[PDB]
Symmetry: C2
Subunit: 398 residues, 2 copies
């Protein structure tokens, strides 16, 4: 049936412990996940009139989105590609912003088909021809699409480069029947991992001004700007505070990773969010003559795209020192001591991803689990698998 | 409910399609270039009689690929890095498998032994007697046998034993077990595969050869055979095969190549031994002139940057004037940037990217689009010959 053995066979079932989970595996600690959702909601209470639209590109899993929305009291999600919107819609997550341009006719048709199915769909554009084909596909299916102009605010990825260009494209949307100009996306991904809280706030300030210049130009032209969306896990505090942005788009907040753990903040604190996402891995080789324990999770089980994964504080407990992860290639991870007990062969360990989203995308299933509380984070003892969820939006980005 | 994943339930193309019919980003295999690499390897190997090719299936994770490789090579079997790749090979009729790594989880052993019991010829590596004993135990339980090879560390410092004495003892341990058979050794140095000059590659593999020969000779002094001496890869295989010590070479990437392997200097004076047959098909979904930028839909999730950026082919330079450079645009965007009369690809246009590293990129896809261009790069004159499930894709179970 399925294209891969992995996507036909779950690594665990309801009621398993971590020792029953086939490795490498992706683990979600629901307790820490719930707490991160709780924390975001509590921070956002301080900014009323600003919506949270959690980014589904982090987890690609409909059951995750449903729980986020329930806990957040939020209405909808973001998807980067049509396939994620397809994953959300089939799992009954029906309020969607495609926070990116979609130019391929067959992908537009899939997105429009969801709006036809009853879903509330937004999509970003930066080009009139793209707007026109968006409108056409929508018209063919007897449905409508919210459309938002993407503005480049300094990330230099996609989007327009002037307030004038925003106006022109909003002007173009006005005269089309199955499309409604709904505002702007202003996302600067390059500011998300700015370490210094004052430097980060200063840089977001510039993004805020660029967004304001766009809202004001539209107002000058007699056009509305009902939604101003953007920001992420790193910057959302500053975008929410601005009075310019109406919606924030954090995705990583719920899971954290070793990159986001390094973000210093206004108070005495390094890293805003509890690590809820882990790669479970088994030690399959030990060589005490070197510094070495080799685990079964390599490149293909943990993305190194933002640096190595990290061993948690519980590892340092009852091993003595904290050993480091280096690549051993596709299917090996090297754990090296910079003397006491190395982990035994057959022993399990939890690895914090260096970067959450790409790591999640290596897996076909998410193992959702809870441990029994008052425990040091990242030990493999006393977990119970609450659920095993298909990651329906996994793939290269259709 | 077909698959855990929409992508693993829905093929990106069908038989007869041109590349413009292929949903992006996609993994394309040029069968013409693939056959030529398989033809070339075979030709070289004809110069080294007695040495068998066991191509590494971890490169492609696809049964239909292994099947074509073995027929083109006249070879008998493949390597698998994890049991999942072995399952995927065995369900697709590839019946002679070496697990070129250690397997310690009992549930994984049962799967592997399951294949042997179903009729597959299975070999597996080890470095520990306790692991050897579980291998034997599971094999006995299903009424089957396993070939077992002692892995030796020969410079890579990954896994394996670090002395010939260790080899002897482990072999002696296998010698007195009923459902296990000491087949010899694996001596693989992955660190030398991308050594650039053939001289340095001959000099450093020669040291690997000496370490391997020491193990064979120590075994012979102990009155035990070393039937199989397996190792080497796409970079080093010629020296391993030339040595008179190795009985088997393990190249995987050769059939596909990548931007990394393309840069290895060869004896004949050529840079890159293999033709690029493996591509990431991508679509320009955004253009910004005077940023000099065309953004493609293939990001981190479609092309691994683990060993370097993907490269545009010579056909791109021929069409647009100059060669653009790929930079990361995050998860779902690839940035193509100018290093001249400014001419960028249009929005909607299709482009082929040579992966920086072939295996991790392959493992991002659920399907392989097998195609032929009528008689480089260029997206113009292709027909899809077959769309094959990559049944071994995953974290490595
Ligand atoms: Mg991310
Ligand atoms: Mg490789």
């Amino acid at each position: 049936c399925a294209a891969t053995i992995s996507a036909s066979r779950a690594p665990a079932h309801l009621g398993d412990a971590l020792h029953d989970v086939d490795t490498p595996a992706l683990i979600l600690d629901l307790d820490a996940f719930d707490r991160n959702c709780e924390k975001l909601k509590g921070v956002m209470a301080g900014f009323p009139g600003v919506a949270v639209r959690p980014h589904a590109k982090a987890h690609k899993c409909a059951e995750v989105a449903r729980r986020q929305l329930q806990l957040l009291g939020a209405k909808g999600v973001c998807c980067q590609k049509v396939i994620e919107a397809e994953a959300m819609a089939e799992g009954g997550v029906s309020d969607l912003l495609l926070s990116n341009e979609v130019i391929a006719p067959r992908k537009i048709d899939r997105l429009v088909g969801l709006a036809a199915a009853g879903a509330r769909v937004g999509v970003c554009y930066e080009r009139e021809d793209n707007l026109r084909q968006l409108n056409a596909a929508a018209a063919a299916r007897g449905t409508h699409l919210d459309v938002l102009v993407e503005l480049n605010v300094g990330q230099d990825r996609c989007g327009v480069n002037s307030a004038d260009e925003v106006v022109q494209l909003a002007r173009a949307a006005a005269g089309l029947d199955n499309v409604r100009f709904a505002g702007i996306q202003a996302y600067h991904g390059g500011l998300q991992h700015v370490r210094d809280p004052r430097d980060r706030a200063q840089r977001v300030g510039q993004v805020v001004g660029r967004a304001r210049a766009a809202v004001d130009a539209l107002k000058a032209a007699g056009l509305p700007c009902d939604t101003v969306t953007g920001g992420g896990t790193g910057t959302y505090r500053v975008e929410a505070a601005s009075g310019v942005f109406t919606e924030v788009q954090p995705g990583s907040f719920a899971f954290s990773d070793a990159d986001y753990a390094r973000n210093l903040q206004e108070d005495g604190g390094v890293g805003e969010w509890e690590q809820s996402l882990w790669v479970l891995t088994q030690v399959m080789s030990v060589t005490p003559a070197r510094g070495l324990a080799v685990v079964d999770a390599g490149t293909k089980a943990v993305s190194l795209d933002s640096g190595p994964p990290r061993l948690p504080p519980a590892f340092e407990a009852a091993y003595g020192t904290m050993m480091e992860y280096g690549s051993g290639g596709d299917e090996h991870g090297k754990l090296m001591w910079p003397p006491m007990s190395l982990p035994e062969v057959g022993s399990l360990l939890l690895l914090q991803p260096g970067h959450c989203d790409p790591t999640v995308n290596l897996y076909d299933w998410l193992v959702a689990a809870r441990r029994q509380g008052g425990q040091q984070q990242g030990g493999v003892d006393g977990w119970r698998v609450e659920a095993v969820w298909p990651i329906r939006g996994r793939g290269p980005g259709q």
